[PDB]
XYZ file of N, CA and C in Angstrom:
255
model
N 95.702 51.451 -57.606
C 94.851 50.366 -58.359
C 94.907 49.912 -58.276
N 96.586 47.884 -58.435
C 95.840 46.604 -57.700
C 96.194 46.891 -57.079
N 96.010 46.335 -56.009
C 96.653 45.551 -54.722
C 98.358 44.348 -54.496
N 98.298 44.713 -53.550
C 99.504 43.758 -53.116
C 100.208 42.768 -54.541
N 98.956 42.099 -54.631
C 99.028 40.681 -55.389
C 98.931 41.113 -56.595
N 97.470 41.985 -56.429
C 98.017 42.536 -58.063
C 99.052 42.887 -58.657
N 99.710 44.054 -58.472
C 101.312 44.555 -58.469
C 102.381 43.515 -58.463
N 102.628 41.855 -57.712
C 103.528 41.137 -57.918
C 102.577 40.619 -59.374
N 101.924 39.996 -59.760
C 101.583 39.124 -60.630
C 101.399 39.899 -61.946
N 102.027 41.241 -61.938
C 102.202 42.127 -62.909
C 103.289 41.618 -64.068
N 103.908 41.708 -62.572
C 105.619 41.929 -61.882
C 106.316 41.124 -63.200
N 105.770 40.009 -62.538
C 106.295 38.716 -62.982
C 105.913 38.639 -64.044
N 104.430 39.133 -65.205
C 104.692 38.833 -66.318
C 105.204 39.201 -67.623
N 105.829 40.839 -66.456
C 106.048 42.079 -66.838
C 107.763 41.199 -67.045
N 108.345 40.459 -66.168
C 109.737 39.860 -66.454
C 110.215 39.206 -67.393
N 108.315 38.228 -67.191
C 108.679 36.603 -67.717
C 108.545 36.510 -69.133
N 107.699 37.411 -69.516
C 106.885 37.088 -70.736
C 107.676 38.554 -71.600
N 106.786 39.806 -71.488
C 108.264 40.762 -72.100
C 106.596 41.557 -72.996
N 105.649 41.609 -72.064
C 104.596 41.903 -73.317
C 104.357 42.945 -74.353
N 104.037 43.441 -75.066
C 103.213 44.539 -76.092
C 102.234 44.959 -74.893
N 101.323 44.086 -74.426
C 100.135 44.821 -74.599
C 99.722 43.530 -72.505
N 99.183 44.134 -71.799
C 99.209 43.378 -70.279
C 98.444 44.497 -69.734
N 97.173 43.497 -69.177
C 96.058 44.402 -68.658
C 95.659 43.459 -66.925
N 96.648 43.804 -66.580
C 95.757 42.494 -64.571
C 94.281 43.199 -64.450
N 93.084 42.407 -64.462
C 92.412 42.859 -63.200
C 92.360 42.020 -62.309
N 91.926 43.385 -61.376
C 91.362 42.473 -60.608
C 89.866 42.491 -60.527
N 88.916 41.041 -60.171
C 88.180 41.518 -60.645
C 87.277 40.138 -59.047
N 87.814 40.410 -58.029
C 87.564 39.763 -56.723
C 86.352 40.275 -55.740
N 85.320 41.094 -56.838
C 84.954 41.773 -56.067
C 83.288 40.788 -56.461
N 83.377 40.033 -57.696
C 82.960 39.542 -58.414
C 82.205 38.415 -58.062
N 82.698 38.354 -56.278
C 83.152 36.201 -55.561
C 83.682 36.219 -54.823
N 83.408 37.651 -54.014
C 82.989 38.211 -53.450
C 82.171 39.966 -52.475
N 89.835 44.197 -49.224
C 90.403 44.625 -49.969
C 89.454 44.037 -51.375
N 88.408 42.728 -50.214
C 88.118 41.857 -51.125
C 88.806 40.438 -50.742
N 90.423 40.140 -51.105
C 91.046 39.569 -50.839
C 92.407 39.284 -52.082
N 91.738 39.723 -52.810
C 92.949 38.936 -54.273
C 92.987 37.993 -54.295
N 91.449 36.970 -55.189
C 90.803 35.903 -55.210
C 90.671 35.362 -56.193
N 90.384 36.670 -57.336
C 90.102 37.045 -58.489
C 90.772 37.483 -59.575
N 91.038 37.566 -60.846
C 91.945 38.583 -61.833
C 91.827 37.884 -62.788
N 91.335 39.440 -64.111
C 92.172 38.907 -65.741
C 92.958 39.353 -66.038
N 93.426 37.799 -66.926
C 94.774 38.207 -67.232
C 94.303 38.498 -68.431
N 94.469 39.408 -69.514
C 95.067 39.399 -71.143
C 97.113 40.078 -70.896
N 97.186 38.857 -72.165
C 98.550 39.279 -72.192
C 98.521 39.043 -74.064
N 99.523 40.002 -74.079
C 100.111 39.751 -75.777
C 101.370 39.289 -75.930
N 101.829 38.460 -76.362
C 103.478 38.456 -76.355
C 103.971 37.712 -77.069
N 104.928 37.533 -77.170
C 105.885 36.700 -78.331
C 105.786 35.289 -77.883
N 106.272 35.290 -76.777
C 106.433 34.220 -76.539
C 105.328 32.042 -76.185
N 104.236 33.381 -76.428
C 102.949 32.495 -76.475
C 103.381 31.491 -78.404
N 104.190 32.270 -78.507
C 104.248 31.793 -80.450
C 104.139 29.347 -80.639
N 103.228 28.403 -81.621
C 103.658 27.452 -80.825
C 103.609 26.629 -80.378
N 102.465 27.557 -78.986
C 101.896 27.008 -78.493
C 100.968 27.234 -78.279
N 99.575 26.230 -77.469
C 98.107 25.464 -78.374
C 97.783 26.848 -77.049
N 96.170 26.813 -77.056
C 95.498 27.674 -76.063
C 95.733 26.879 -74.565
N 96.056 25.583 -74.540
C 95.824 25.212 -73.321
C 97.293 24.969 -72.444
N 98.062 24.852 -74.305
C 99.982 24.973 -72.729
C 99.988 26.484 -72.626
N 99.583 28.243 -72.892
C 99.763 29.529 -72.799
C 98.916 29.509 -71.536
N 98.102 28.717 -71.279
C 97.151 28.307 -70.239
C 97.683 27.928 -68.653
N 98.776 27.056 -69.393
C 99.810 25.739 -68.395
C 100.583 27.260 -68.280
N 100.900 28.394 -69.324
C 102.600 28.082 -68.749
C 102.000 29.371 -67.985
N 101.405 29.954 -68.244
C 100.578 31.320 -67.094
C 100.457 31.652 -66.064
N 100.081 29.181 -65.702
C 100.017 29.024 -64.269
C 100.940 29.325 -63.701
N 102.592 28.374 -64.562
C 103.155 27.981 -63.239
C 103.472 29.053 -62.683
N 103.506 30.330 -63.703
C 104.213 31.274 -63.411
C 104.295 32.212 -62.198
N 102.381 32.464 -61.722
C 101.937 32.442 -60.988
C 101.515 31.041 -59.822
N 102.528 29.984 -59.507
C 101.585 29.380 -59.568
C 101.714 29.448 -57.777
N 103.326 30.363 -56.956
C 102.792 30.854 -55.574
C 102.185 31.312 -54.533
N 101.610 32.295 -55.816
C 100.227 33.044 -55.513
C 99.497 32.022 -55.598
N 99.275 31.069 -55.717
C 97.781 30.180 -56.118
C 97.563 29.275 -55.740
N 99.411 29.040 -54.353
C 99.580 28.632 -53.244
C 99.358 28.782 -51.799
N 99.012 30.868 -52.385
C 99.335 31.705 -51.013
C 97.910 32.072 -50.826
N 96.313 31.559 -52.020
C 95.107 32.857 -51.798
C 94.953 33.417 -52.930
N 95.963 33.342 -53.858
C 95.101 33.373 -55.664
C 93.772 31.787 -55.571
N 92.836 32.235 -55.934
C 91.662 31.206 -56.021
C 91.539 31.301 -58.016
N 91.943 31.795 -58.526
C 91.600 31.938 -59.845
C 92.262 33.049 -60.467
N 92.755 32.236 -62.143
C 93.473 33.930 -62.976
C 91.552 32.689 -64.726
N 91.295 34.427 -64.871
C 91.135 33.268 -66.527
C 91.945 34.637 -67.701
N 92.731 33.421 -68.464
C 93.757 33.804 -68.932
C 93.271 34.276 -70.577
N 93.716 35.216 -71.092
C 93.324 35.269 -72.185
C 94.753 35.673 -72.656
N 95.260 35.418 -73.936
C 96.942 34.753 -73.998
C 96.448 35.322 -75.614
N 97.591 36.154 -76.287
C 97.880 36.168 -77.528
C 98.739 36.432 -78.299
N 99.387 36.319 -78.587
C 100.621 36.557 -80.025
C 99.946 37.839 -80.682
N 101.274 38.858 -81.129
C 101.220 39.724 -81.219
C 100.774 39.357 -82.797
N 100.953 38.524 -83.420
C 100.424 37.454 -84.679
C 98.732 38.219 -84.991
N 97.965 37.099 -83.775
C 96.798 36.836 -83.500
C 96.001 38.027 -83.187
N 96.105 39.332 -83.638
C 94.968 40.243 -82.603
C 94.848 41.085 -82.998
């Protein structure tokens, strides 16, 4: 399935957000093993309660910043609470 970066991204989000639903989709092929440069993320987590869309976005970027500083180019983020699905 996922390459090494994809697996790290999934594990980091699982560890920090304990999401009820999590999808990590490598879409590097759309922009270019293709490099693991682009992922779509769909995360359903309690941790987003009370946070604006942009705050949720920035939270995820912060958690994954080490990837962004070493080959990860873009993340497309859908971040919802269980109450929102």
